[PDB]
Amino acid sequence: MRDELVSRSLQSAEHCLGSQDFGTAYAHYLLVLSLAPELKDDVKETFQYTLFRWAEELDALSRTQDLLGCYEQALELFPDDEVICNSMGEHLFRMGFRDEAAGYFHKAVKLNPDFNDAKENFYRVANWLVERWHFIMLNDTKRNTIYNAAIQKAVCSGSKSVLDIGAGTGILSMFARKAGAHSVYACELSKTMYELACDVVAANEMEEGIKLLHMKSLDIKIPKHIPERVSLVVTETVDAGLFGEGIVESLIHAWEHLLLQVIPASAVIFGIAVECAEIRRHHRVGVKDVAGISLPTNVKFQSPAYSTIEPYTTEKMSRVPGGYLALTECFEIMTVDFNNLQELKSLATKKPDKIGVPVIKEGVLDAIVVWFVLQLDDEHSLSTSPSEETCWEQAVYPVHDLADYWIKLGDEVIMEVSCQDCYLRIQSISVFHSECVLESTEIALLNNIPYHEGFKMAMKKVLSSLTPEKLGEPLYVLDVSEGFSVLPVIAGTLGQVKPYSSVEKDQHRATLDIICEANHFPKDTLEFWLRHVEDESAVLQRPKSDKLWSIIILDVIEPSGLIQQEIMEKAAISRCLLQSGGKIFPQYVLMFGLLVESQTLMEESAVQGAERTLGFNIAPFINQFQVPVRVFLDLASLPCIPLSKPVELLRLDLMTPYLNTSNREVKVRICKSGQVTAIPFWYHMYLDDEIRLDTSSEASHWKQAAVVLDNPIQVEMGDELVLSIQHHKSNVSITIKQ
Ligand SMILES: Nc1ncnc2c1ncn2[C@@H]1O[C@H](CSCC[C@H](N)C(=O)O)[C@@H](O)[C@H]1O
Numbered sequence: 001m002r003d004e005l006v007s008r009s010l011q012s013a014e015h016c017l018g019s020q021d022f023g024t025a026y027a028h029y030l031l032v033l034s035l036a037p038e039l040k041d042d043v044k045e046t047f048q049y050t051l052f053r054w055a056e057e058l059d060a061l062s063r064t065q066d067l068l069g070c071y072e073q074a075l076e077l078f079p080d081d082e083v084i085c086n087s088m089g090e091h092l093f094r095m096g097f098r099d100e101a102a103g104y105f106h107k108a109v110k111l112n113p114d115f116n117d118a119k120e121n122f123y124r125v126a127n128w129l130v131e132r133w134h135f136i137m138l139n140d141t142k143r144n145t146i147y148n149a150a151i152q153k154a155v156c157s158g159s160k161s162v163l164d165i166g167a168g169t170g171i172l173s174m175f176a177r178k179a180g181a182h183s184v185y186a187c188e189l190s191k192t193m194y195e196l197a198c199d200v201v202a203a204n205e206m207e208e209g210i211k212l213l214h215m216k217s218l219d220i221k222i223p224k225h226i227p228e229r230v231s232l233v234v235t236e237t238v239d240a241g242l243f244g245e246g247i248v249e250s251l252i253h254a255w256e257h258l259l260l261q262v263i264p265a266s267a268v269i270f271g272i273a274v275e276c277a278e279i280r281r282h283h284r285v286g287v288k289d290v291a292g293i294s295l296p297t298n299v300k301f302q303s304p305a306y307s308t309i310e311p312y313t314t315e316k317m318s319r320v321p322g323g324y325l326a327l328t329e330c331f332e333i334m335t336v337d338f339n340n341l342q343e344l345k346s347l348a349t350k351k352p353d354k355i356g357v358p359v360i361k362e363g364v365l366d367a368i369v370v371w372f373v374l375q376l377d378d379e380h381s382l383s384t385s386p387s388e389e390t391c392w393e394q395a396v397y398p399v400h401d402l403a404d405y406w407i408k409l410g411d412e413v414i415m416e417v418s419c420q421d422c423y424l425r426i427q428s429i430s431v432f433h434s435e436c437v438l439e440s441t442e443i444a445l446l447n448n449i450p451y452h453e454g455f456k457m458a459m460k461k462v463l464s465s466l467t468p469e470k471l472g473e474p475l476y477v478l479d480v481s482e483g484f485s486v487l488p489v490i491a492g493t494l495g496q497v498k499p500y501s502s503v504e505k506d507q508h509r510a511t512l513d514i515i516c517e518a519n520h521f522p523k524d525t526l527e528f529w530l531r532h533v534e535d536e537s538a539v540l541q542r543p544k545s546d547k548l549w550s551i552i553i554l555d556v557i558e559p560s561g562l563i564q565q566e567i568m569e570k571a572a573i574s575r576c577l578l579q580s581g582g583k584i585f586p587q588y589v590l591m592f593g594l595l596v597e598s599q600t601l602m603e604e605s606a607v608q609g610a611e612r613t614l615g616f617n618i619a620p621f622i623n624q625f626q627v628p629v630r631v632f633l634d635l636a637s638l639p640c641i642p643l644s645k646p647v648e649l650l651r652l653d654l655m656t657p658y659l660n661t662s663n664r665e666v667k668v669r670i671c672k673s674g675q676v677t678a679i680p681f682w683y684h685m686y687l688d689d690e691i692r693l694d695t696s697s698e699a700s701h702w703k704q705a706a707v708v709l710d711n712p713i714q715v716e717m718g719d720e721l722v723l724s725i726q727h728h729k730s731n732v733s734i735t736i737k738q
Contacts, residue, residue, distance in 0.1 A: 006035050010043070013050070022054035026070070033077050040078065047074075048084065052091055059095050068100060075104075082111040086118045089125075098125050099191045116728045123627045129192045130625035132604065133391070134168065137236070138622065139603040139612040140391035143382060147172060148614060150263055150376035151234055152179040159232035163187075163258060165217045165250055166237040169618055170197040170210065176234065177206045185226045187213040196621045204616055217250045220258060234263045240314040240384070241395040241424040242267055242336075242372050248344055248422045255341040262338045266375040269333040269424070270385070273413050275325040275363040279315070281447045282440040283367070283398035291452040293489050296518040299511055301436045302400050303443055311425055313440070314393040317369055317386040321636035321698065327365065327407060328357045330385075333417055333426075352418035352427065362408045368397040368415070368426055397426045410434045436511050441559040442484045444701035451693055451700070455487055455585070458687040459551055460494050462583045466550050467495070471581070474498050477551040478529070480538050482564075484508050487553055489516055492525050500529040502538035540573050548579035554654065556589055557683055557695060560631040561705030563591070563652075565730035571654040584654045586685040586693070591650035591732070593681030595668060595721070597712075598640035601630055601678040605708040628707055635680050635696060635704045643672045643715065649681060649725050650732065663726050670719040677713075679723075679734055680706040707734045 009028035016025040029047045033040055051074050058067040071088055078084050085108035092101035105122035108115060137143065151172065155162070160182040164173045167186035177184045188194045194214040201210050213225055220226060233254050237245040251262065280286060283303040288295050305311055317324055333355065337343055371384040371394050384392040399405065407413070416428035438446070445451070463475055474496040479488045481502065488499030489512060503509055509528045516526045529538055542548060552574050558564045574584050602608070606626040607619040647666060653659040670676075682696035682704045695702040713736065715721065726733040 007032055017050070022050055022057055025050045026054045030073065030077070048087065055091065055095070064097065080111050082108045082115050082118060085111065086115065086121065090121060093121065093125060098128050101125060102129060102192070116731070116733075120728070120731045126625040127627055129190075130622070134622070135607055135626070136391040136604060138169065138171065138607045138618060141612050143391060144171070144612065144614050146376065146380045146382055147236070148175040148179070150380040151175045153377060153379070154232050154263060155179040155181050161228065161230035162232040162234060163226065163230040163254070165233065165235040165254065166245070167197060167212070168193050169622060170201050170212065171613060171616060171618060172234050172236065173210050174201065174204055174206055174616055176232070177210055182209065183230070184210045185213070185230065186210060187215055187217055187220060189216045199621050200618050203621070218253050222258065226258065229258055229260050231260045232263070233259060238374065240393040241310065241312060241370065242269060243419060243422050243424050244310060246422060247338070248347060251338055252341065252344045255344070264374045264376050265337070265339055267336045267338070267372050268375065269335070269370060269372045270330050271333045271368055271370045272326055272330050273328040273357065273365055274317070274369045275327055275366045276320060276322070277366070278321045279367040279396060279398065281444050283313070283443060284400065285443055285446045287447060287449060290446065290486050291449070291456045291490055292493055293486055293515065294518055295515060299436065299514055300401065301438050301443065301446065303398055303440055304437065305398050305400055308421065308423070311397070311423065313396045313398070315396045317394045318389060319637045319639060321634050324369075325361060325363050327359055327361050327363050328413065329360055331355070331357050333370065334419070347419050348422070350419060352416040354414060354416050354428070356412045356414045359407050359409060359411050359413070364405050365399050365407050365413065365431060366405070367399060368429065370395040370397065370424070370426070395424065397429070399429055402431070407431050436507060438484055441701050445484070446486070448699050448701050450697070452486070452490060454687060454691040454693055456490050458585065458691050459491050461688060462551055463494050463497065466579070466581050473547070475550040476500070476543050476547060478549050479553045480540070480555060481553055482537065482555045486512070486515070488512070488526060489519065489521070491551065492516070492521060493519070498527070498543070499525065500527050500543075502529045504530045540570070540577060542577055548582060549577050550579060550582050552578070552582070552584045554584060554586070556586060556685065557702055559702055561633060561682070561703040562629065562631060563732055567652070568660060568729065572657055575655065575657070585687045587653075587655050587688065588686050589652040589654070590648055590684045590686070591652070591681060592646050592684065593649045593679050593734070594642060594646045595644040595670070595676045596640040596642050596678055596680055597674045597676060598638065598678050600639045601706060601708045602712070604630060606710070630678070630706045630708055631703065633680065633704045633706055635682065636698055638680065640678070641672070641674060643674050643676055644668050644670055649723065649734065650727060652727070660727060663724060666723045666725065668721045668723055670715045670721060671717060673716040675712045676709065676715055676736070678706045678708045680704055709736070713738070
């Protein structure tokens with residue numbers, strides 16, 4: 001009764017499926033599969049479904065506890081099966097368990113290193129886990145050298161017990177240990193960071209006096225974790241705005257619990273007022289008419305200038321597209337002594353304070369650029385000014401709501417400063433002349449005029465071509481652009497047009513209707529197509545009738561610089577909903593790129609060996625999380641050396657299916673001798689065969705991307721290389737051959 005008496009579990013699991021019961025079905029399928037390897041492929045997909053829905057049931061009951069073990073059993077049943085590994089990793093990633101799905105993606109890649117989707121998902125998980133700026137920090141030789149010198153000077157002064165807050169890779173704890181610290185303790189909130197910090201400390205042979213903890217500093221207890229109050233506290237929990245990573249609260253906790261009567265010792269914040277057209281394009285709507293659509297003055301847009309995410313942006317002002325003008329002189333904003341618990345407490349209960357700065361160059365007030373000097377001690381200090389090429393960035397406070405932004409010689413800039421929520425907040429920015437929440441990409445979209453001009457022209461062309469008078473009931477226009485878009489309002493002016501906007505914000509819909517009224521629109525015209533209860537994007541149907549669409553504005557390019565996923569599938573869906581003459585915008589897309597030499601991209605993607613880290617071996621452990629593509633790039637101010645001519649890497653036709661090829665190859669003319677390190681790329685969107693939008697143009701809101709290489713390639717002027725390009729459904733892969 002071992003062979004026959006089995007699949008009664010299967011016949012009961014069918015009944016359980018009929019009753020929406022997945023636990024009994026999962027257990028029955030476990031019984032059937034673990035007793036019959038012959039059925040592993042017969043009920044593969046049904047078991048997959050059963051386990052997915054049972055895991056959803058378990059997550060609804062807050063039973064991750066056993067959900068992870070259930071997924072582990074599912075793996076145990078199927079050994080080398082990269083398909084199940086990948087699919088289950090995506091299901092774990094979807095439920096919010098990235099720290100756990102990372103291992104499943106790693107195993108899926110280990111079973112087949114050529115699995116496309118496995119690697120393309122592992123890169124997502126690694127980008128979410130390890131943060132990019134870490135790579136820029138470990139490669140800062142100046143930062144590492146100065147921190148090592150300061151920690152050594154502190155240890156030689158009598159500090160034998162050192163605690164590292166925000167240890168990350170544990171390189172600061174290793175600096176302390178190598179300097180001769182007796183007791184070294186480190187803490188890091190991230191699971192993955194603790195994970196590879198263990199590896200780094202072990203391989204560098206320092207697990208003796210370095211005790212690692214997986215917790216925030218605010219969770220440390222004495223003597224439960226560390227046995228005593230330490231004599232030294234090191235940390236690098238600082239950002240562009242210093243307080244952005246919460247050093248104040250952590251150091252208040254450290255002085256109140258874990259310290260004897262701190263590196264860094266102090267900080268002096270400096271600021272300046274800058275003119276910059278790019279910052280203005282990203283954080284201020286300059287134009288008041290958008291291709292014939294008048295924006296009313298009572299509807300004022302703003303960027304995330306908050307009043308709880310950062311109320312400022314971060315920019316590398318040392319390489320801003322175009323440049324920047326210093327309208328004033330570098331002036332002090334505040335000073336923080338990290339060896340002052342009184343001041344650290346008073347900053348929370350501190351009221352704002354005003355500062356006035358004179359103008360030295362007449363221009364346009366566009367932003368407030370803020371950096372700081374981190375005083376490790378009386379000797380060592382690290383600056384983050386744009387004149388210094390370090391790893392850090394500069395904080396940028398935008399300037400909203402002023403009658404005139406022109407400042408002259410003799411005027412001042414008056415501003416309040418406050419650190420009331422441990423976040424550097426500069427407010428009340430005004431100029432005494434001497435006697436909607438749109439994102440940065442949305443602001444730059446409104447500021448981008450050629451986009452709207454070309455869209456209006458192509459829309460008018462197609463609409464007039466579809467009207468019966470020239471073809472020999474109003475026309476329907478669909479806009480599925482992700483975010484704010486005035487394209488439906490533009491289309492509404494071109495005759496009997498029914499525009500549909502997929503914008504999902506209530507605020508944005510109200511604003512679009514107010515703008516329509518400002519343009520004397522019948523309010524019934526602009527209909528908002530936010531249709532769903534829980535759908536990712538506005539899934540594509542026809543209107544209330546099957547009267548097929550005339551114009552469908554798809555979203556093809558992600559503002560990160562990559563091609564937006566499910567593009568060809570959504571285009572194939574949309575092609576069936578067009579009438580005999582309809583159009584999908586864009587009509588096609590040409591992906592262009594070139595080969596360059598950039599040390600900047602190399603050091604942005606991965607760590608450059610023990611050179612930068614001063615002997616300590618950290619690159620092999622952290623470069624496991626390096627990704628092949630840099631996103632959100634401005635090729636306008638990219639520090640590199642071009643090595644070839646820009647060529648077409650890909651074509652993507654959205655009206656024609658059978659065109660968009662797969663494994664294409666391109667021959668590239670190497671027109672300069674050097675070292676290929678990366679492949680930047682951008683796009684040209686052809687709406688009409690005449691009209692073209694250049695995503696690399698300095699008026700575009702989009703960003704460019706770049707495939708960064710692991711090992712730089714040596715080439716000479718006159719050589720010709722080959723590039724293999726794959727458009728795998730929702731991803732683009734660019735590999736090289738000599
Ligand atoms: N109070 C705290 N306790 C533990 N980790 C913290 C923390 N505050 C911030 N962090 C984390 O520490 C990380 C900083 S890494 C900064 C230092 C760098 N890893 C080095 O040793 O050279 C951030 O990812 C942040 O999330």
